[PDB]
Amino acid sequence: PSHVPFLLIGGGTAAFAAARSIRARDPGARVLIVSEDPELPYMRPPLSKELWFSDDPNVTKTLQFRQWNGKERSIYFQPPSFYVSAQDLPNIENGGVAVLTGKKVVHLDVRGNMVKLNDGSQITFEKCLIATGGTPRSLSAIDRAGAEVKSRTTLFRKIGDFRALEKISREVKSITVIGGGFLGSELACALGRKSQASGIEVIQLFPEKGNMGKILPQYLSNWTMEKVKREGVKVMPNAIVQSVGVSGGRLLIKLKDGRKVETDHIVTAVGLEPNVELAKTGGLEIDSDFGGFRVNAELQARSNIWVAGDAACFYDIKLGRRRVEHHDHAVVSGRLAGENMTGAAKPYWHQSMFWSDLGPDVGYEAIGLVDSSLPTVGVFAKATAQDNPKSATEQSGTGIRSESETESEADYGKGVIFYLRDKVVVGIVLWNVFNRMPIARKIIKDGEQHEDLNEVAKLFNIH
Numbered sequence: 031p032s033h034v035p036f037l038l039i040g041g042g043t044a045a046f047a048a049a050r051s052i053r054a055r056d057p058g059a060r061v062l063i064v065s066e067d068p069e070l071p072y073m074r075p076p077l078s079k080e081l082w083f084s085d086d087p088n089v090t091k092t093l094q095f096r097q098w099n100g101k102e103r104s105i106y107f108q109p110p111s112f113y114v115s116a117q118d119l120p121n122i123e124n125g126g127v128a129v130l131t132g133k134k135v136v137h138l139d140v141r142g143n144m145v146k147l148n149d150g151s152q153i154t155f156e157k158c159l160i161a162t163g164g165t166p167r168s169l170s171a172i173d174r175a176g177a178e179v180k181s182r183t184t185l186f187r188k189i190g191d192f193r194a195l196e197k198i199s200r201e202v203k204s205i206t207v208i209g210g211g212f213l214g215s216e217l218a219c220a221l222g223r224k225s226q227a228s229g230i231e232v233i234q235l236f237p238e239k240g241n242m243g244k245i246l247p248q249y250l251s252n253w254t255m256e257k258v259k260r261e262g263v264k265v266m267p268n269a270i271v272q273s274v275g276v277s278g279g280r281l282l283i284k285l286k287d288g289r290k291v292e293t294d295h296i297v298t299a300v301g302l303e304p305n306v307e308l309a310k311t312g313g314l315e316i317d318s319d320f321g322g323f324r325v326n327a328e329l330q331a332r333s334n335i336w337v338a339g340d341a342a343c344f345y346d347i348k349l350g351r352r353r354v355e356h357h358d359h360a361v362v363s364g365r366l367a368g369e370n371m372t373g374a375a376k377p378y379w380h381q382s383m384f385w386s387d388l389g390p391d392v393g394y395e396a397i398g399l400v401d402s403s404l405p406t407v408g409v410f411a412k413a414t415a416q417d418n419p420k421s422a423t424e425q426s427g428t429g430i431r432s433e434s435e436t437e438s439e440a441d442y443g444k445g446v447i448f449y450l451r452d453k454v455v456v457g458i459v460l461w462n463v464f465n466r467m468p469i470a471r472k473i474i475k476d477g478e479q480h481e482d483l484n485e486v487a488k489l490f491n492i493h
């Protein structure tokens with residue numbers, strides 16, 4: 031038994047953003063975050079990226095990474111002294127953010143306004159937030175298998191997982207990566223580079239005809255496969271796993287089409303499933319279409335319960351009911367999540383943005399609704415020295431691209447791809463086009479039926 035006014039569940043990108051949001055509005059509010067992880071809230075994007083590109087080993091320790099412009103940066107959101115302890119909190123009377131790492135909420139009670147930690151202790155809340163994110167999908171073929179194979183397989187998302195992998199890559203001869211996602215691909219390049227240094231084999235395999243095939247059009251997905259390949263990666267499309275066994279001391283991957291890949295370690299990056307274990311005890315709605323907790327436009331589930339981030343199935347007027355997995359989204363909705371908690375009764379209006387880096391040399395931004403199967407227009411040109419994340423970082427000063435681009439709304443190598451529906455732009459992927467995301471947002475938000483989409487591209491430096 032004990033009490034805190036602002037309590038937030040899951041200690042991630044969304045929880046920390048709300049934590050900052052509430053503080054801003056109610057200065058002197060007492061905030062407590064509970065987190066499964068033993069780590070203090072940190073951003074995630076460096077884990078599949080810039081953290082792999084440092085030649086300093088004690089950076090596997092400190093997690094102080096280098097950007098493409100080469101300036102240090104801590105992974106954790108703020109230094110730890112910024113927090114206040116969890117016991118000292120009620121007596122701080124001036125408020126702060128306290129962090130209960132190593133604990134887990136296992137019972138919610140909406141009428142009773144209290145959670146239950148795994149160790150059985152209880153905490154009463156006045157205002158609660160569920161920002162639990164998600165657990166990466168396993169691959170049912172790996173589930174039927176023994177604990178021996180299960181062990182030789184990681185599911186990349188945490189820091190525990192970043193260190194574990196990077197460790198293995200200095201140990202074995204061949205790491206296979208399952209998943210044609212951005213993560214998958216980022217990973218595969220991250221490994222691909224290290225490979226150019228140890229000789230290790232990096233295989234990437236996935237059911238799609240190409241990298242990010244479910245998103246990008248064939249011709250750009252295909253181009254992307256080449257870059258993955260060039261970074262030293264034996265890449266295997268149209269791959270569908272049948273079984274994973276152990277023979278010759280190694281891991282054997284059998285494919286539905288007969289092929290057989292033999293390897294040392296599997297890292298699987300094939301989706302996220304949203305953490306909704308709390309919904310059963312408390313009794314909130316989940317979405318069977320999109321997954322995760324059903325909230326309204328004010329990201330609200332029931333009185334004194336808001337949800338945000340990757341677990342957030344929210345309504346969005348200029349689009350409809352949704353659930354997205356952006357970092358940008360987690361920052362914003364979290365913020366909004368804390369804004370609403372302190373009686374701000376406000377809608378969600380942001381257009382969340384995604385981004386991916388494959389190395390310092392190639393970057394994709396995306397926003398809106400992007401699917402390969404929708405009608406597509408893409409305009410393309412030869413890229414200039416600026417058209418890559420290295421420059422975009424040297425300029426803006428940051429590596430987290432949703433920062434460089436703000437959340438406002440104003441021989442080929444770069445271009446923009448419009449995703450249409452009825453001569454009207456509904457999604458956008460930008461390839462190596464930087465600091466033009468507000469123009470991306472504007473176009474989508476307006477919704478005009480351009481009888482020529484070239485002109486629209488003249489807006490991204492494309493001539």
Ligand SMILES: Cc1cc2nc3c(=O)[nH]c(=O)nc-3n(C[C@H](O)[C@H](O)[C@H](O)COP(=O)(O)OP(=O)(O)OC[C@H]3O[C@@H](n4cnc5c(N)ncnc54)[C@H](O)[C@@H]3O)c2cc1C
Pocket residue numbers: 039040041042043044045064065066067074075076077078133134135136161162163164186187188213305307308338339340341354355356357358360383384385386387
């Ligand atoms: C390697 C990697 C890279 C990415 N790169 C990019 C990128 O480059 N660009 C981009 O736009 N997006 C990227 N994303 C996606 C983006 O980072 C996520 O959508 C966002 O960070 C989600 O944050 P969240 O806090 O909502 O979820 P999380 O960050 O998962 O926070 C959830 C936390 O809640 C805890 N938790 C869950 N259930 C309970 C419980 N019952 N009790 C207590 N604690 C609980 C978990 O332990 C976890 O620590 C990336 C994701 C990963 C994994």
